[PDB]
Design a protein around this ligand. Structure first.
Ligand SMILES: Nc1ncnc2c1ncn2[C@H]1C[C@H](O)[C@@H](COP(=O)(O)OP(=O)(O)OP(=O)(O)O)O1
Ligand SMILES: Nc1ncnc2c1ncn2[C@H]1C[C@H](O)[C@@H](COP(=O)(O)OP(=O)(O)OP(=O)(O)O)O1
Ligand SMILES: Nc1ncnc2c1ncn2[C@H]1C[C@H](O)[C@@H](COP(=O)(O)OP(=O)(O)OP(=O)(O)O)O1
Ligand SMILES: Nc1ncnc2c1ncn2[C@H]1C[C@H](O)[C@@H](COP(=O)(O)OP(=O)(O)OP(=O)(O)O)O1
Ligand SMILES: [Mg+2]
Ligand SMILES: [Mg+2]
Lengths: 480, 480, 480, 480
């Protein structure tokens, strides 16, 4: 019967035997060897935590919220079956993450298999399928009153959305609210965030400005457009705006730390140079690469942060180039950050243009004395899209609220009904430039190119522009 | 010699004997009987803390920062004398607060002595003067190397600004940075905030999004316009914006909680009805009122939260009206919140108009069935100015930064150099309306007046407008 | 309907309307004006907390545990009625505390009304009776399914024990376990402790070594001697020992801090000198003293920490003596701690003997040069009984455990089955001596008397004996 | 110049450039891949932390304490040189740890190379030597005013004790107190503990009962027996006893968790079965085993937790046996805990007897019906020595204290001068028995053997003895 796990964020979590059974598989335990924050550990030494513990946390909160709704509203007829299905989805939405988490689907796969479209969510589903089949979980699900045909569909839909109008098959419109819990496609307000805010802050040594327990206490289900949706108490609208401010602030300080990102980049680089030579045994002894392990779940199961050390410790001279990069990390000879700027007004930059940016920076011609001349391959240019989870859209516009005087009546709240101190935009781009040539003079040069390039493209003045390129900044009137 | 105090926020604080001597006086100990958050305790039961502990905290952080600067830059020639003066100012800037803190100078005095102009800062200075003189502190200051003539001036200036060009007398332009520590008139970034953020969050059960220790580690002094000012590392600019976001959020959730404010109001009302009958003995046996105790520091010394209980426990029928209000608080029959709205576009409301607003709301004529008709005296209207500490101004525009490549060279950073996700405005007004008549029907009515009044004045649509006044909201096109 | 309160220790607590109604009375709200830790605030400035918030906490935890038992074991047939009754007892066990909490029943009443026997528990019951009657709570109890005759008895028994074998009337032997929750007379393991551990640590700035949530998750009810009792999982026995270690450690560092205690003593002294002159209006306009207010609950209601300030701020020269003592506290001219010692071996000291100890210390004749000669009235001697809650008894010997392999079978665990690193004794006495004469030479003398007295009585050598009385310590062989 | 690192336990730590240089080496960065708590991660999912972060913490606290002593007492003439040497020793005392930390030197090496004597301390020294030489650190040490000949000796002595009367060469008797900071051989009170208490509690979700900051504030150096030693303020003696209670409690609940230990045991077993086949390249391409990598630091550098996954992911059938054990861990088919007991009175068990205990348990002949008969190889028996760090000795007897009235005069404090509630013994043994045969009937049998064996050897009655072996416990009178 049921187990208790002590978690520093949530305290003692009770786990239903079915969930234990799911947890105690190689597919799930694999998450113990995948850092939540990837290269962030190398900047924030507190951040040792792995996707495993985060997954328990999500599972538990999913459970908390669904239970709370059932207690508050029996009329919903939430069953233990529904509860466990939501918890399982909670536990399992991180199953698909690869080495160093977002480094893998955010940097490595895009560059190593550009044609394929892949997300950790896709992978979570496949890994889940594989986990169920490989471990005879279906019988156990039935033993506790679950219906695998319907429920496995439901669970997958919770994670990834429809597998193709009410587009969901796993549950009907009257249980629409269950899809809003683990991975909310409508506005991004889900228990996944709540766990990582708390867990990441605890580990990074930053403090979390969002109360998820509070939010659970005020959550109700109401009818909205013939769907039953989760609604938040009206006055909590400020807390929701703050939730996304907090998310943005965590990305600014931690998830997109300039050095954290450059380490992610150097690791990705090394993975690219090892991809040809590393072999991972999949189903039936068949062999895959780092970049193809995503095609066989038995291979993907063995693909974790360990790869990094496999490479670092290798003696094969095939891997000399990859290994040498990782060693530079250890000695802390990293590519050097040059600076940060943003596009101006309407200007927006797409993924297809990314490869051509180092070339543009090298093409800048600053009117300054240069010892060394720098080449496109010497520049790395990271473009980062910061938003409130919905590109240009305001997610609070996609949230339903209920007032105390009419608790069953859903309503909408506009930005102007809340505050004038809110942002007018909800998306932006940051551009970081780094140089692969580390010496004083290369770095000095790189600054001139960079700042010149900003001026050429009419980007925003880097904060330290006047100090790093005092001869370049005067040419631009707007800058001063 | 020196004492150690254990504080839940800062741990063990060391106190120089001179500071102990200052602390162990009636004037200072008085702060033990003054709640930091006033009426907020009646909403947030964690908020039992008094100004006393907050004052130690401020003192300590003042000391931390001044010491840190001296360690980092000996060339500043910060003396122990300077350190103690800053700490004393730190300890003493809350000396002038009255019962329930901001209730007293924010609500009570304005209404009870409208002709006088008064602030707790004014009072801190007078109370400090009184504390020094009444306790023979001057000899002790000299004993530890302080020069009372110069230093007492310095201390007062730190708290209140110039007592009347370099306008400060207590210290020269080369020590300009010492004025920026305890009460920063230039941009509001001071240790007072840092302590209350941490202390209030710990007690309220909210979490603080600002790392003051970090800020202290990155603080340097640089020349700016022939002044030596405290400068912050450039990349910490985001943390500063977040500091004020946090401040605004604390006000939204706690310091301006609608019910917290109404309790402050009811306490103010009771004080008004007792002001004629409560007598407080000042200097030479002379007697004062609650509203006149501010004229004699010996009387003000005895004016604390105790007044509230004096009134509650009184048997004198003179005080029946005041006592009856406090009893309604105990039974939780409070004035009832009707709703909240804001002015539109440019509209701004001054203090002189405040008294006339209940009258405007009563003058609204909603086209709805009314059992009761409500009068101006039945309405309370609270107008709340939310800003980043400098009305319409952005305080980060008044902050100086230094880059890592040129640490002595101060620079400025504009909003656009940081983010497009920042606010476009830095000030706003909230209007809350409450009704003194509590029954169902008076309340129902009050909602109609309120919503009608909003429509009449072209204010923003209250969030729950459609639910509380469904017959009123349709008339306004813009609202729907 | 139900309210949510944000508590820093427990987060958001939900409160049933009935409990709200009980809370929103003058008798309950009174607890807002009574410091949990009395004089400890004057040592630990974090400790601003009042009995009110503690009481909410205890209420909530009582609820948590009773709910957990019902969820785990439906066969117990715990009703909502039972739940609310336990919560009410939880909320209400601190109702009887007087000014500065344990100062009042621990020091003041014993000295001021020696003939009467009184405890805050007695008073909690009376105040509860008074609260129910004075506020028409009985109808509201019936409205929510409670049976006042039985339930009010039950609630009182939970707080104070039997009002006179199964000695309880409010509930039968089959619900015996409900008595173990709020105030466990059998072994002292109850939710009251769990709240104060957490709450006091949070405020004092100390850290709590006991996980009550864990304990709740492992709690079961089992049959023991034809009673149904709460049983703890066997392996949690170490945690229980640690619970009492933590309690003892809190008393050592905080609740019995030498200076905290002396302040309690000086406050008590001032109350004694004011007792004749302070009048408090009880039932029918009849008037009481501080020391007699315990006889009429209407008067006791108005007896709070406020008394302290009433006295401090008084101008009546009747109160000059009392007032002067409080002023010495403010200036921090406190009675001076001389030292601490313990009885040896079997020696135990009774409460009646307390009055004769100052006399013994003054009777010591140390062979040393004395400027001043000290008198019995110049000495204060505080005797403190430190135990695990049950004098000489080990409370874990009165705890029932269950094993995982037979969850319904209760068992006992002896000390030797746990560890040899546990204490061999569970009770002891500390003796502190203070001098009322504060000057260098009186204090120097006092140390000689004290240390001599220790030697005479064959008490333990004070830790600093050799430093304070180097001429006295050599005479005792055992000491060196 | 200097770097700042954000640590969740200590906040922002400043690092001197020299220390950064030491940190940014393969030898130091290796610690990132070694779990502080080894197998405890598999029980406490919060415990993801590695030795790396702990090492920074120790470095920083070493620095805090030495600085504090210098500030308090300039007469000590502590130089920046001394400071950095202490910090380097702090950073580097964990350099020698092997995979899963104490699993490696506590279980694996003892069994795999019984003839060799080895500790992580030995290895820390060797790894340090290797780190200095392999990275040209000596020049950098000289650049900052260090004298490698004297200082490297000093640093090593701090870690391991004398390398062979004042037995230390690195510094004279007048700087004796510097040896007490990083690794205190006299009484075990050092900054290593302080960091792990705080860091481990934060991660395990347990709470730490020891205030190291406080202790640093009250630490002074005094003369004791012609040495200058660190002394603690007398009244802090209780906090020290509590420090060790906390240590013992952490071991009870976490470091010696029965299942955590069994996982360590299964990992060890797998390492043994892989030891023959895993090869690790050391100096000059020469190859070592897991068990011999301790002989060449270049090989040891590459020996980390990674080994575990290397084995788990291997396809080599040489490793089938090792791999199969790790897989049982992943599926959570672990050896089963049977129970725990202790020796009685004087009985003590030496290391030489350990191998023979499974045999004794199998030799027990319980008078009960047995389906299966169990063999010595089916039993694991773990013997755990719990003490206060000094076997039978009380470490507080080896601590020096200073009183407030004579701060330069060291003194001693005995147990009886503190409390009678302290332990009478400071060392004990726990015996845990596990069965490798997991089925119902094997497990049932195992309990009979175990309990019978306890009875035979006159060990303490297992807590659940009566439930698991009701037929066996009656035979022993003492048990009942
Ligand atoms: N004393 C403690 N305090 C806090 N957390 C603990 C303590 N002991 C164990 N834990 C943690 C470790 C685990 O994540 C979780 C479960 O541990 P534990 O209760 O010992 O389970 P177990 O499986 O070992 O016991 P059993 O199977 O015998 O019930 O709680
Ligand atoms: N063991 C403790 N742990 C944490 N904080 C403590 C402890 N003991 C006391 N404190 C707190 C309470 C006070 O605010 C502050 C100082 O108390 P303390 O150190 O006992 O000074 P004291 O003035 O009582 O002793 P002395 O006058 O003999 O130096 O520290
Ligand atoms: N944003 C917040 N975060 C954390 N706690 C909060 C926040 N806002 C309020 N609290 C606390 C203060 C109270 O103790 C508790 C209840 O406050 P609140 O939810 O505002 O009730 P209320 O009575 O004002 O609203 P209503 O009656 O309109 O539901 O929550
Ligand atoms: N906003 C933040 N709040 C708290 N900690 C932070 C924040 N930003 C960074 N940190 C942490 C992460 C690192 O462990 C440590 C180093 O900080 P950081 O200033 O990012 O150094 P850096 O090397 O990237 O700056 P630079 O090299 O430009 O001086 O501080
Ligand atoms: Mg003292
Ligand atoms: Mg850097």
């Amino acid at each position: 019967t049921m187990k208790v796990i002590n978690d520093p964020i949530h305290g003692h979590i009770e786990l239903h035997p079915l969930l234990v059974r799911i947890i105690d598989t190689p597919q799930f335990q694999r998450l113990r060897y995948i850092k939540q924050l990837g290269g962030g550990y190398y900047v924030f030494p507190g951040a040792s935590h792995n996707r495993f513990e985060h997954s328990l946390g999500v599972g538990y909160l999913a459970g908390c919220l669904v239970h709370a709704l059932g207690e508050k509203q029996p009329e919903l007829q939430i069953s233990e079956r529904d509860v466990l299905c939501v918890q399982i989805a909670g536990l399992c939405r991180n199953l698909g993450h690869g080495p160093f988490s977002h480094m893998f689907d955010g940097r490595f796969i895009p560059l190593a298999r550009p044609e394929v479209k892949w997300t950790h969510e896709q992978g979570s589903v496949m890994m889940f399928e594989h986990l169920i089949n490989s471990n005879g979980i279906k019988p156990v699900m039935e033993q506790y009153g679950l219906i695998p045909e319907e429920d496995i569909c439901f669970i997958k839909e919770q994670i990834v959305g429809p597998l193709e109008l009410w587009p969901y098959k796993g549950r009907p419109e009257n249980k629409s609210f269950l899809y809003e819990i683990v991975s909310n496609k409508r506005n991004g307000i889900d228990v996944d965030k709540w766990d990582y805010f708390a867990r990441d802050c605890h580990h990074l040594g930053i403090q979390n400005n969002f109360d998820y327990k509070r939010f659970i206490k005020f959550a109700r289900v109401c009818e909205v457009d013939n769907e039953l949706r989760i609604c938040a108490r009206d006055k909590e609208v400020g807390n929701l705006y703050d939730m996304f401010h907090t998310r943005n602030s965590l990305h600014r300080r931690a998830y997109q730390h300039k050095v954290g990102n450059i380490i992610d980049t150097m690791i990705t680089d090394a993975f690219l140079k090892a991809d040809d030579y590393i072999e991972i045994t999949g189903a039936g002894g068949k062999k895959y690469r780092i970049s193809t392990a995503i095609d066989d779940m038995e291979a993907y199961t063995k693909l974790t942060d360990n790869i990094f050390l496999e490479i670092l410790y290798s003696t094969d001279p095939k891997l000399k180039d990859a290994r040498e990069i990782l060693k530079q990390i250890e000695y802390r000879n990293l590519f050097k950050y040059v600076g940060e700027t943003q596009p101006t007004g309407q200007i927006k930059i797409k993924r297809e243009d990314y490869e051509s940016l180092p070339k543009e920076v090298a093409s800048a011609k600053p009117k300054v004395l240069l010892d060394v001349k720098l080449k496109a391959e010497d520049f790395i240019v990271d473009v980062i899209n910061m938003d409130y989870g919905m590109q240009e859209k305001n997610p609070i516009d996609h949230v339903s609220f209920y007032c105390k005087t009419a608790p069953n009546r859903a309503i909408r709240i506009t930005k102007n009904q809340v505050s004038q101190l809110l942002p007018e935009k909800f998306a932006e781009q940051l551009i970081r430039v780094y140089c692969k040539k580390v010496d004083r003079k290369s770095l000095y040069a790189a600054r001139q190119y960079f700042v010149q390039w900003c001026a050429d493209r009419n980007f925003t003045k880097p904060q330290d522009g006047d100090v790093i390129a005092p001869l370049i900044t005067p040419q631009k009137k707007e800058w001063n």
